Structures are given as structure tokens and as C-alpha cells.
């Protein structure tokens, strides 16, 4: 192919220094991403022995990621060949992609994750590029987490070693620094105009996903809106419900709590934090296989607990985990015995258990409020969150 020839050339010579590789790598990457016959290009490079060479000399992990994500994502019938060549190449320099944000993914796992993700995006309808939407500039206080900011939790500076110890010791001022920003939920909503609310919703939903696998997409990453809508379709929900759940979480979220959420999850302690857009709990994602529809079983069986925590910090994975969990809460509700849930009955008089089994388009508003309570807290134990129902309801209204 045109692209194989081109790449054959950049490979026609060894590389002097770190910078040459840098520019040559960048150039092969773009060629791959703009190539219209990606399968035939891989087949040509395979034949030449050049496919293996390509992987061997795109050295710096940062660039190996872009290369591996792009190839895994763009190829189909020849993808197995790229995987084969990658594996062969790893024998020498095994470092591959397994560094920084991606330390919990073996390199081949990174390839397989990109492959599944690319396939799921096309299949489920969220491959299409998002518009460069605007993100909040906040770094503190309510709505300063990834939802508002677009800053991936995984990119945040380590919490100082000293403060980590203070967290472990439950030092009030430090715990406060790193926890839910909100106490009085109603008081927070009160300081927001309907326009402010609407602006938070747009900010939240309109910006590109903060993904850990950007090059697994054909072009730029999709908007969160696109991912939520795809997830609504897959789980028989609505993007508006998914949106309202996440917006509420994200108002009760700060940059600092993001940092805590992720770092504690991947620490010695392997804390069971709630992470990312929908604040999904690590143990919950594992126990209910919340990644089932984005990742194939082989990959899923290989993920360590910390790889799971890291995925929860990738917006698409989080959004699908959140949606799947919502559908799970609703299904479980539809199977309850309402006479055995009198507190629920009391707080939400128009609740309709049967309706939960179907699309939210038909839920009474009280189903939304009840589910909200049963999303922050244990589901359908008849013990309620006093404040989350109205908090989520308000966000729902905005959508």
C-alpha cells in the first residue's frame, strides 16, 4: 500500500537520537491514522518483516501507545498479525506500554483493550469524533472533578506522602480536603441559576471523553454525550437519566477527591473508592462485571483489581459501567416486594416497581428519585438517602 511503502521508507534507516525517532514515530503514527487501507498495510509490512521492526524501534512508551492503539483500532481481519508481531517484538524490550498511567496494563492487554474498545465503539455507536467542547477551569470546590474539568484523575499529582499517612490516620482537616465537597445539598442548588445548571450540564456532557485510549478511536475522542447516548441504547435507559446521575456525582466531587479516589484505589491498601464520572466503586465493577459490553471475556479475566480501578477513570468505561449498574439497580427494583419496602413506599408514594423493568421514558418521577437514593446507597434495603433524591431530581429536571 501507499502507507506501507511510506513506512518502509521511514524504516529504511536506523535512527540517530531520541528526537529523530520522535519525529519519525509521530509521522508513522499519522500515516497509520490517515491510511485508508489499514488491513492491507499491515499485511504488506508483515510480509516484509517490517511489521516486527516497526514495533521494535518505536521505543518511548508514550509513542508505543499511540502506535499500538492506532493499529489495534484501525485493523480488523489483519489485526491478529499485528498482535503476533507485537508479541514477538516484546521478547527484547518488554517495557512496551506498561508505564505511568498505564502501569497496570501488560502491553498485550493494552493492545487487546484497544481492539475491544474500537470494536465496541463502532458496534455501539460512539466511534464518531467529538467537537472540542469547553471545560471548567476550576481546581477546587464543587464541580471541579473530571466531569467539569476534563482533567483525568490518573494525571493528577500524587498526594504528598505525609498527607497519605494523615488520611490513613483520619486527620479531619485532611480527610475533609479529599472528600465530598458538599454537606447541605439544597443550599448548593440554591446558589445556582437555571442557566448555571444548564451550563454545568453542557460542560459535563459536551466535552470529549477523558479517555486513556484516545488513539483507539478513528479520529478525535467522542463527546461524553455520544457515549451516554450509546449507553442508554445498550441498557434501555435514556442519556438524560445517565446524565443526571453523573451531574449530581460531579457536583459532589472535587479535583482533590479525584486524586484521592484513584491513588487510594491503586495504593498498598487497594481502597474500595468510588471513581470517575459515575463514581463507580471498584469492588462493585468487579462483582457485577460492569465492563462486560466494552471488553471481551478473555481481557476481562486478565484484569487486576488495579487495572479495573484505572479503567473506571477512563470516561467511556466509566459511563458504560455506570449505565450498566443503573439498569441493574432498576431490574433488581422491579423484582422487589413493595409491601416489604414501607420506608421506600412512604418517601416515594408514586413509585412503580414494574415500570423499572422498562425504559425510563415511562418511569414516574418517583422512580427516578428512589433510584437516586438507591444509587448512592445500598440498593433496595429500604434504608434511604434523605438528600440525594432531590439532588438528582433537580439535575434530571435540567436535562
Amino acid at each position: 500500500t501507499a502507507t506501507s511503502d511510506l513506512i518502509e521508507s521511514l524504516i529504511s534507516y536506523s535512527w540517530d537520537d531520541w528526537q529523530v525517532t520522535r519525529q519519525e514515530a509521530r509521522r508513522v503514527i499519522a500515516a497509520i491514522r490517515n491510511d485508508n487501507v489499514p488491513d492491507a498495510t499491515i499485511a504488506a509490512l508483515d510480509k516484509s518483516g517490517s511489521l516486527i521492526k516497526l514495533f521494535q524501534r518505536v521505543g518511548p512508551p508514550e509513542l508505543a501507545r499511540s502506535l499500538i492503539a492506532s493499529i489495534a483500532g484501525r485493523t480488523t481481519m489483519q489485526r491478529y498479525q499485528a498482535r503476533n508481531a507485537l508479541i514477538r517484538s516484546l521478547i527484547n524490550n518488554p517495557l512496551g506500554t506498561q508505564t505511568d498511567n498505564w502501569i497496570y496494563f501488560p502491553t498485550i492487554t493494552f493492545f487487546d483493550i484497544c481492539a475491544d474498545l474500537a470494536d465496541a465503539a463502532g458496534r455501539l455507536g460512539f466511534a464518531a469524533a467529538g467537537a472540542t467542547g469547553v471545560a471548567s477551569q476550576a481546581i477546587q470546590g464543587p464541580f471541579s472533578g473530571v466531569g467539569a474539568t476534563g482533567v483525568n484523575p490518573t494525571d493528577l499529582p500524587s498526594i504528598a506522602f505525609g498527607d497519605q499517612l494523615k488520611l490513613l490516620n483520619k486527620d479531619p482537616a485532611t480527610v475533609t480536603k479529599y472528600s465530598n465537597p458538599l454537606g447541605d445539598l439544597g443550599a448548593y442548588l440554591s446558589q445556582l441559576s437555571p442557566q448555571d445548571k444548564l451550563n454545568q450540564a453542557q460542560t459535563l456532557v459536551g466535552q470529549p471523553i477523558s479517555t486513556l485510549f484516545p488513539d483507539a478511536y478513528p479520529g478525535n475522542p467522542p463527546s461524553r454525550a455520544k457515549v451516554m447516548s450509546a449507553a442508554a441504547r445498550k441498557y434501555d435507559l435514556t442519556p438524560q437519566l445517565i446524565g443526571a446521575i453523573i451531574l449530581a456525582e460531579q457536583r459532589d466531587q472535587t479535583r482533590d477527591e479525584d486524586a484521592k479516589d484513584y491513588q487510594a484505589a491503586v495504593s498498598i491498601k487497594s481502597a474500595n473508592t468510588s471513581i470517575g464520572l459515575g463514581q463507580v466503586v471498584v469492588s462493585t465493577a468487579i462483582k457485577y462485571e460492569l465492563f462486560t459490553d466494552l471488553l471481551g471475556q478473555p481481557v476481562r479475566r486478565g484484569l487486576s483489581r488495579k487495572a479495573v480501578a484505572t479503567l473506571l477513570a477512563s470516561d467511556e468505561f466509566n459511563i458504560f459501567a455506570t449505565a450498566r449498574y443503573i439498569r441493574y439497580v432498576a431490574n433488581l427494583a422491579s423484582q422487589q416486594d413493595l409491601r416489604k419496602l414501607p420506608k421506600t413506599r412512604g418517601a416515594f408514594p408514586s413509585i412503580d416497581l414494574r415500570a423499572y423493568a422498562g425504559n425510563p421514558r415511562n418511569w414516574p418521577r418517583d422512580n427516578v428519585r428512589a433510584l437516586a437514593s438507591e444509587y448512592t446507597s445500598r440498593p433496595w434495603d429500604d434504608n434511604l438517602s434523605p438528600g440525594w433524591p432531590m439532588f438528582v431530581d433537580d439535575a434530571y429536571a435540567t436535562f
Binding site: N180, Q279, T376, S377, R378, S385, G387, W388, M390
Partner: protein, 122 residues
């Protein structure tokens, strides 16, 4: 952080934790954190005839010697649900405190629940 004194027909004496709502129950009082919080604390303090289970964990509480247990359930986005059960000798009887809250940051201190139990008598 305690205010009103509360006395049960069964002889149990405790204080109402400040910022909490008190309700009388079968053998004591229930306290639910005030306001409309995302994740309120819930406490119960009861008089109990039956002795605790053998071999529970043991902790020094004031003068000393409570036996307790902490259980962790799946919760929601505010974290797992944590339940304390704690018993102190009250002569030949027992005073018992149950407490609940969610935490995504590991086991809660339950400081307020321990306090309540410590300041409890009959």
C-alpha cells in the same frame, strides 16, 4: 457534641448527640443525623438482657472493655455500608450500640457511636 439527656422506661440513660434526631424504640433510642444529607449517620442505643457472642473483638472504652464487631456491605456511590455492633457490661445486663454509615475510605472511626456508648448507663 451531646446535648439533651434521654431516659427510657427500661432505665437506660443517654444523651442526644447534637445535630441528631431522637426517636424512642423498643429498648432504647434511635438517632438519625439531622438535615437532608447524602450520607447521614444512624445510631441506635439499646438495653439488652442477652449477652454478646463469644470471641467478638475487644476494645478499651473509658473504664474499659467493650466487645464489638464491624460488618461491611455493598453500598452505592457514597461507598460501602459499614455497621458497628458494640456491647458494654452494665452490671449483669448489657448496653448495646449499633451504628451505620457509608464510607468509600475504609472502615469509619465510629467515634460518635463509641462516645454515646461510653456515656451510656442504667
Amino acid at each position: 457534641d451531646f446535648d439533651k439527656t434521654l431516659t427510657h422506661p427500661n432505665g437506660l440513660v443517654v444523651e442526644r448527640p447534637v445535630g441528631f434526631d431522637a426517636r424512642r424504640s423498643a429498648e432504647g433510642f434511635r438517632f438519625d443525623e439531622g438535615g437532608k444529607l447524602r450520607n447521614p449517620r444512624q445510631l441506635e442505643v439499646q438495653r439488652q438482657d442477652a449477652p454478646p457472642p463469644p470471641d467478638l473483638a475487644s476494645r478499651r472504652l473509658g473504664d474499659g472493655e467493650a466487645r464489638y464487631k464491624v460488618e461491611e456491605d455493598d453500598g452505592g456511590s457514597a461507598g460501602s455500608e459499614y455497621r458497628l455492633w458494640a456491647a458494654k457490661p452494665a452490671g449483669a445486663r448489657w448496653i448495646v450500640v449499633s451504628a451505620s454509615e457509608q464510607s468509600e475510605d475504609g472502615e469509619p472511626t465510629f467515634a460518635l457511636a463509641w462516645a454515646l456508648l461510653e456515656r451510656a448507663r442504667l
